[PDB]
RNA sequence: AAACUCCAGUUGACACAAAAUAGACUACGAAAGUGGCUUUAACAUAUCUGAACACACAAUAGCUAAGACCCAAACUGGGAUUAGAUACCCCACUAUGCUUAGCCCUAAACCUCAACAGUUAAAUCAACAAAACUGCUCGCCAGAACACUACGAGCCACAGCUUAAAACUCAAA
């Protein structure tokens, strides 16, 4: 179909994104993305899918290092297209719109929170 | 503001400019050389090169301040460093041998020390969300702990169910608790720490 | 089911390090297409749309490896301007 | 001596022993990795089952039994009654790639079964039976 | 008779709370015009009991009472139409009946009066239905009247009852 | 949730079903189509063009007789769901998809390019599509809608297929 040219030119919603993860964990779970992206061992979060089904918002859990999240997101970003691919060519939906990856930060509140209780003095009967 | 953003804030410390040229590093023999340059505001009336200067103690007393009156202040400041100081003579002439050793009688160990212990590492943001208003625990800051601290202090020498009891006594006895993990501020304190303890699943909404 | 076991598919174990051989078994699955075919006979894809999708693929690859070629192959201007000024 | 990767073969003569036993004597541990459960059965080089495990059989209900967690407890489980039965080193045979794939096989470990070789058995047909439609969600 | 206007859609919408042209998942006749040519092909009304089905914003209960009707029965499952079918009632006193419940189980055959049931081998007893409701309740209870005319039973106890 | 528990896991035996990888190949056939292995037959024509109807073929769906039935699956039941739910998800199971002998004769049956022969020089050339043309032949077309329609005729087709109008209307399409 001249390829060449072509180049060189709610309750449904929560169970998409309940589907949504678990197809991209699984394809997380392998090298059939790739490799790079295989030896980082991504974790996500939540799938939240927006109201108008115009994107996919894939929150992936960060990291401590910060060179290690820079690298990881910047392996997500390159890799989302082939993975919208792998999903539609699979027929886990037959349209999924653009994957964009967000990071997640929530779990730093509780974290340092924690850190810092363990430390602190309550005084008598805690 | 009377002066320029040129103008730049001085820096009173007396040893700093009194280090051998061999110990600069070549930053700071460039942030010297760049000072040359720049202007400098008058320093204020306040800290002073002097060697008894005191930041944390001129600060409680600009916290204590009303209505601008810091000769009143500053008198009470003084006054209580004096009643601290008297009371620790006072308990070290009547202690036995050994606990001569265990007994801290300047004034200035005591008041910092006394500051220390009643400031808090976690506090609360308050922040109404959801239509009902939350509580949510964070990390304060050095600064908002420190200032909690005297805060705390002052308010509670401020307290009307001490009738007549004049502030140095108050500010000394309250400062003595303080020194030994006691009194209503490290209450205060603990009961701060444990009411963001019984709320750490708010810590989600940050 | 005919074939003898222990012989396809199968991977040793170096020094107790499990999660290296299953890594390991993970990329020859991969590369050997097993994974995608058992992704992809999950649900049958109608002959159409496979063929679509297989000359997609194929032009694809054909495009992006002529976009690298171009690109590796102008690279070797991108050095400092030997007549700087003029 | 260089590892290799590939397993010993019955008829050829080897050196690798564990416990004294040939490769061709050690008991095989097979997982089958649903999507939705893990099962785990430890059976002897004779085909004697020795121990079996489940996500179900562990008290995982729906849509628990389809993770990571519940695998490891079923292989933990299956390790257990299986060191019951002087088992020590498994040939794991895994089939499937449901969640438990990975977490079944280290329950197995935290058990402590010793994992000498691991087999992938999913069934991949050359194009027999047609699958499902695809689910027009 | 001066009779309440017919909701828009805009009102519709923020009836059903849901802020949006998109979520309605329900279609509605909001021409009058549509309504009476309904209503006249229905037949002649005056002085006629009518059970109206799924009404919702009214523009086939208004064309019917414009016709000289005895009594409406109006049967509707939403009860957010309720208030405007109300304000209706308020228009016409006496000539509006609303009731809440399903068409598919609410009982008919007790609504009207004995003294309008006649034989069956008569005409058709002067009590007619009308309804505009959803494609997916129409044939359940197309299919439940039917078996209702084959037991003369239901809607169908006051005679050859007619259905538009 | 229903369903099954004559259920499930390992092992062994075991199709009238469908043919991973090779294939990142681009082949064969008039087209439709054709991609598991072996063997037997076998892929017209030493000018070209030449048919709605002549003579032979035509994917999928559909219909007669018989058979097979793993899996899939129009319909048909059941489970779950808002406030007139999910047509959509889950379970079970038909016609049908398969074989044999006959029908039916339709596709975005498309490279949306009629067959043969020739040219690359011209102003290349409305636009887009797929560079622009020449010779010769057959087929077809002359505003829109009425109309993939009505009537007539033909057909193993019986509200089916092929051929295919007129009146009224409009200044557009
Ligand atoms: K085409
Ligand atoms: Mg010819
Ligand atoms: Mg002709
Ligand atoms: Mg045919
Ligand atoms: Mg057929
Ligand atoms: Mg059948
Ligand atoms: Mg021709
Ligand atoms: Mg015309
Ligand atoms: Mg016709």
């Known amino acids: 179909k001249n390829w060449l040219k072509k180049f060189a030119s709610h309750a449904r919603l929560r169970a998409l994104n309940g589907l949504l993860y678990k197809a991209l964990t699984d394809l997380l779970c392998t090298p059939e993305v790739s490799q790079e992206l295989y030896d980082l061992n991504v974790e996500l979060s939540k799938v939240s899918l927006t109201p108008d089904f115009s994107a996919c918002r894939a929150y992936w859990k960060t990291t401590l290092s910060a060179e290690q999240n820079a690298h990881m997101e910047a392996v997500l970003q390159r890799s989302a297209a082939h993975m919208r691919h792998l999903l539609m060519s699979q027929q886990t939906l037959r349209n999924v719109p653009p994957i964009v990856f967000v990071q997640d930060k929530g779990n730093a509140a509780l974290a340092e929170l924690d850190q810092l209780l363990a430390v602190a003095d309550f005084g008598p009967r805690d | ?206 | 089911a005919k074939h003898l076991k222990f012989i396809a598919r199968t991977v040793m174990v170096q020094e107790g390090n499990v999660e290296s051989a299953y890594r390991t078994l993970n990329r020859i699955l991969t590369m050997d297409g097993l994974i995608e075919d058992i992704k992809h006979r999950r649900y049958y894809e109608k002959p159409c749309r496979r063929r679509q999708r297989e000359s997609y693929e194929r032009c694809r690859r054909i495009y992006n490896m002529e976009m690298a070629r171009k690109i590796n192959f102008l690279m070797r201007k991108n050095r400092a301007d030997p007549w700087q000024g003029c | 001596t260089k590892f290799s990767i590939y397993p010993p073969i019955p008829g050829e003569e080897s050196s690798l022993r564990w416990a004294g036993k040939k490769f061709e004597e050690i008991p095989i541990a097979h997982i089958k990795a649903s999507h939705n459960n893990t099962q785990i059965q430890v059976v002897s080089a004779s085909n004697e089952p020795l121990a079996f495990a489940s996500c179900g059989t562990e008290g995982f209900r729906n849509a628990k039994k389809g993770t990571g967690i519940a695998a490891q407890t079923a292989g933990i489980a299956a390790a257990a009654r299986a060191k019951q039965k002087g088992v020590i080193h498994i040939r794991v045979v895994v089939k499937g790639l449901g969640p438990g794939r990975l977490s079944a096989m280290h329950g197995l470990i935290m058990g402590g079964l010793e994992v000498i070789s691991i087999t992938d058995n999913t069934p991949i047909p050359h194009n027999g039976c047609r699958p499902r439609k695809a689910r027009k969600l | 008779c001066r009779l309440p206007p017919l909701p828009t859609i805009r009102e519709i919408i923020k009836l059903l709370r849901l802020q949006a042209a998109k979520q309605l998942s329900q279609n509605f006749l909001l021409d009058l015009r549509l309504t009476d040519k309904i209503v006249r092909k229905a037949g002649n009304l005056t002085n006629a009991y009518v059970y109206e089905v799924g009404p919702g914003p009214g523009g086939i209960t208004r064309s019917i009472l414009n016709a000289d009707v005895a009594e409406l029965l109006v049967v509707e499952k939403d009860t957010r139409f309720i208030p405007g079918l109300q304000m209706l009632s308020d228009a016409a006193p006496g000539k509006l009946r609303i009731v809440h419940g399903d068409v598919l189980t609410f009982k008919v055959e007790k609504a009207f009066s004995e003294s309008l049931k006649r034989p069956w081998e008569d005409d058709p007893p002067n009590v007619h239905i009308i309804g505009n409701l959803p494609f997916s309740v129409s044939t359940p209870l197309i299919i439940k009247w039917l078996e209702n005319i084959s037991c003369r039973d239901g809607p169908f106890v006051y005679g050859r009852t007619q259905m538009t």
């Open chain 2, 1 to 206: 503001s009377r002066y320029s953003p040129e103008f730049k804030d001085p820096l009173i410390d007396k040893e700093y400019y009194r280090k051998p040229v061999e110990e600069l590093t070549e930053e700071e023999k460039y942030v010297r050389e760049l000072k040359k340059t720049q202007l400098i505001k008058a320093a204020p009336a306040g800290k002073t090169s002097s060697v008894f200067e005191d930041p944390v103690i001129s600060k409680f007393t600009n916290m204590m301040m009303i209505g601008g009156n810091k000769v009143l202040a500053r008198s009470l400041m003084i006054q209580t460093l004096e009643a601290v100081k008297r009371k620790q003579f006072e308990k070290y002439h009547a202690a036995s041998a050994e606990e001569q050793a265990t007994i801290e009688r300047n004034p200035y160990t005591i008041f910092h020390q006394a500051l220390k212990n009643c400031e808090p590492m976690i506090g609360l943001v308050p922040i109404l969300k959801g239509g009902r208003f939350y509580q949510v625990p964070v990390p304060l800051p050095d600064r908002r702990r420190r200032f909690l601290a005297m805060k705390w202090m002052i308010t509670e020498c401020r307290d009307k169910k001490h009738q007549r009891t004049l502030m140095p006594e108050k500010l000394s006895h309250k400062l003595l608790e303080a020194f030994h993990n006691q009194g209503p501020v490290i209450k205060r304190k603990h009961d701060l720490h444990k009411m963001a303890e019984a709320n750490r699943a708010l810590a989600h909404y940050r």
